[PDB]
Amino acid sequence: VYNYDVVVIGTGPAGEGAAMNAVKAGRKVAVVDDRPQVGGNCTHLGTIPSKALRHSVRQIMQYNNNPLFRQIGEPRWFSFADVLKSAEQVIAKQVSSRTGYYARNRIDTFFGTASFCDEHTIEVVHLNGMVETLVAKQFVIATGSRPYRPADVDFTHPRIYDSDTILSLGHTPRRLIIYGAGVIGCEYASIFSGLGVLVDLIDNRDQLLSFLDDEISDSLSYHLRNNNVLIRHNEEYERVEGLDNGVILHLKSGKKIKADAFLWSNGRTGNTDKLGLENIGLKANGRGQIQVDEHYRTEVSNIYAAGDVIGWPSLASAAYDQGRSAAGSITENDSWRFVDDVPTGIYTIPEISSVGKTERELTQAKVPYEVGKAFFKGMARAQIAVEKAGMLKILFHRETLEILGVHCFGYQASEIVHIGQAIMNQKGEANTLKYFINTTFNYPTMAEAYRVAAYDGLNRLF
Amino acid sequence: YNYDVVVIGTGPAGEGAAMNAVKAGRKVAVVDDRPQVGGNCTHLGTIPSKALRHSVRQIMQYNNNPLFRQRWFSFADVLKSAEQVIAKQVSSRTGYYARNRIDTFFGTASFCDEHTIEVVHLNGMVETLVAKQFVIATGSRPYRPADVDFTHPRIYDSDTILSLGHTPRRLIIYGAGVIGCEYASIFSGLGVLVDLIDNRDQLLSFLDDEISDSLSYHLRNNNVLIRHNEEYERVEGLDNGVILHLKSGKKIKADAFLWSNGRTGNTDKLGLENIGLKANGRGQIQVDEHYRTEVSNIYAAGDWPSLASAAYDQGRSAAGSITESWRFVDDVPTGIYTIPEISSVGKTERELTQAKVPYEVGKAFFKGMARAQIAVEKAGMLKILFHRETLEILGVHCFGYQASEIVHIGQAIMNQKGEANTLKYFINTTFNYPTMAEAYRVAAYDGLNRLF
Amino acid sequence: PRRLIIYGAGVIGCEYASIFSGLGVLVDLIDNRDQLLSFLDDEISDSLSYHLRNNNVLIRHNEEYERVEGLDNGVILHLKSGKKIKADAFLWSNGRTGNTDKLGLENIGLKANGRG
Amino acid sequence: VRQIMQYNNNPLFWFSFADVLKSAEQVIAKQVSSRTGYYARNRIDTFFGTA
């Protein structure tokens, strides 16, 4: 039997943020996670491995396409294991840093499966015995989610994978099939295309990432097509069949596609079945998500849920800040803020980032805006980076010069979009495009785009 | 020829001034003595050095990456990559000039009176140009003291160093300036024992002490030998290597030599005495807050701070002042592109201590940064100086990979007025992950712990 | 011209937009549909739109004109969505009408629809 | 050569042989890179020697 003030379930970004914010408030807090090591999906099976894979693929592409490195010999193809082995050092460093953060503030951890009993009692169960019941006044739910696994699709087949088991690949397949045009699907399609795999990406919609800007989606589709990715639109699978040497997918429309592997990336389902939330009396929808208010509090006054478990936006930074806000709400130390605006980020090759309104929404809302474009092809920093494809678009109000939406696609997109976001968050006349002409930047960087694009807007203004 | 505004120099200052003036609807023209547009920024200064540094970083990462092991290269092969970037930049600038109907004259410009100039090319040209407004963007050149033989094949400057054909075994850099530090870092990355010589006791004293100390430690760990408080006595060029005798009594022998001490304005050929303008010892032109010289219709911009972006902004501000958009370029984020990069904005810790401002320090080390770990660049640091009571940001300093792109968020938060410029923004704003911009958040939290 | 506005994303409009972009003019193509040449394949339309965007052509989607005012130094087009675009010229390529009004088809019982 | 001919005989507006031949190396480099990629993707072993 153990007693605490705040107990967090799951050590992901939401759980870590909630635990840190709560322990900063002076309470005694504990964390529970069924994985043998801390970090959550952000470090073990999700963000960190995929990002290391993407960075290694980008380095491979740049090394192969750099003439200076071609004098040593001919281009060499590399196995998937060698590319993935670079993620082990990164995940080890990250888990060491996270456990050091936990230990420095003296936060107790319990590496075992969690299970709810009542409004205060939880049965943290290990693999062997370890009832180890815990009682606390406040609870944070950061159980996250797992890849969606339809019953009609078998996953025990060695040639069929999901967003988690794909890292278990031993050899680079000649071909590949990706179902679902989500963030994970597009990222893996870009990575495998960089590795040199004819990826047959399958989408359930007619446009890739319809929630993004039309121009950005069109450019991404063109680049994917130019990088051996075959994109099929308005498709629904009918049956997937595993063979000895490949996987054959028969679509509803009548097309059958055979590849050497398969990767399902269509949605995620919250990990709430093992929680036993019915003992609390709370309910989970078909998506496995938990309804929370603007204070990140569930129906029970002492039960708080935040992060990827609640569904939208399912972003690691967003989950982290949501957990911190939920902990602030628990402690009522005026640190709460409803996470609503999150800069959308897609980590393909190259990257995509967005903040604020899109062009289609602005057109529907009849806002008198204007467009300022800056193309990476004419950029000194981009030319030195040997990365020429890309663009940045700034949507700015014509009369008040207010910024209504910033969208970028290319190299360092996520780092670039942050300055536009910072200018966006300003109130009143401070949110102005003229800042980009009234402030000196560094050179040669990619931030100079915010200069050039601004000019491309001001010329269109009369 | 008759025009409204005539600009001398096609660098960032001149190009910006010409573009801003032509945006006003006037008829403008540009003159330069280089056979191609771009200025020293693209042809001899910024762009070639940046390409060299990026190639050095790439080869260093390739060598250190275990995946790429299953290989030293000559200096010429490394420098070859800059030609494509230079060609693309000059093509883009020529397209920008042509699309705007900008007349270009490729010859040295000399002043005749307050309104007209003579353009002389390589083959004895004479062209008269008269305009109401003039812009001076002649840039600068490396300072050349008399007592050093720059004609020696083993002695170079910040310009002729690109003429190197073979990578030297040892090298000497005089002057601990931004250019000197950048070249020392590049040559150290290439694998050359660089002996940097500094006149003062601290590298880049205008920077924060912590940043300078970290940079010095990294340079020392990267085969660069830094000597402090030294002044040259005599440079002697032997057939095999350059020998420098210092005032302290030391003799240093190397296979090359680079001079990066100071810059000299390119005003001797302008003949400013024909219009009533004088140049100081360093060849600079005194200007007011409007970037205007003593003559009412003569304006000078660009090549302090001698920054390409700052020169661009100064040229655009001078053009706006001519057309009546003016803004005095005073606060420029200092950026040194060594390996790793260094950037700073706002007041440093020494100035805050002198002024007794009650501030506090929030740190976020890049060693624990996830994105930095993926980049395999763990050495770094992000320091934020924030006012304790009103939570205003008084200084942002960064030393690491992608420092320049990081510092711009702190600069954007800085320029806000009053309560808007607050550190708590970094707590109430969702960043991208995994990014090193989100490191800001960590730093902010590392500050909020120290509050009470 | 310094700048140019093209109304209608038809064959003629796209051809002239490409020509003027090649000449080095910032073309602002205006389309009444959400996609360029919806009767064509999605991949081909996407590639053409990407090339036009990369070649200084600014494509705006789902727009309908409200008033084309002719200034002395340019033309300002006011759209239904609230966007006003100023250029140094203007080109109309929205459909064609049959040249049958002058034929006088009523003398033979023949008639033409609204499209001529 | 055809482009040179159409340049000289165009109302809108000699060349050294080396300058004219200079354009072929970009094409040959692109072609050899593409063929090497084709060989490597399907895993065909190469031996650069006299058989």
Ligand SMILES: Cc1cc2nc3c(=O)[nH]c(=O)nc-3n(C[C@H](O)[C@H](O)[C@H](O)COP(=O)(O)OP(=O)(O)OC[C@H]3O[C@@H](n4cnc5c(N)ncnc54)[C@H](O)[C@@H]3O)c2cc1C
């Ligand atoms: C390939 C890939 C790449 C991604 N890249 C990004 C990216 O770049 N940026 C981004 O923002 N997001 C990214 N994501 C999304 C990412 O998964 C989430 O944004 C985030 O990592 C989840 O945060 P969380 O703490 O809410 O969930 P989690 O981190 O998944 O929290 C769940 C944790 O609790 C444990 N747990 C689960 N059930 C129980 C239980 N019953 N008892 C005890 N412990 C339990 C789990 O084992 C896990 O450790 C990516 C996802 C994938 C799959």
Ligand SMILES: Cc1cc2nc3c(=O)[nH]c(=O)nc-3n(C[C@H](O)[C@H](O)[C@H](O)COP(=O)(O)OP(=O)(O)OC[C@H]3O[C@@H](n4cnc5c(N)ncnc54)[C@H](O)[C@@H]3O)c2cc1C
């Ligand atoms: C190695 C190196 C690295 C640098 N890196 C950076 C960096 O990363 N960032 C940064 O911001 N700055 C950097 N700089 C500084 C940069 O070179 C200057 O800040 C900037 O280029 C000056 O702009 P300008 O147009 O005023 O001068 P210039 O670019 O020098 O423009 C002067 C032009 O006019 C021509 N000219 C000169 N005299 C005459 C005449 N009498 N008649 C006609 N034409 C004439 C010159 O040939 C030249 O083309 C670097 C400098 C060096 C040497």
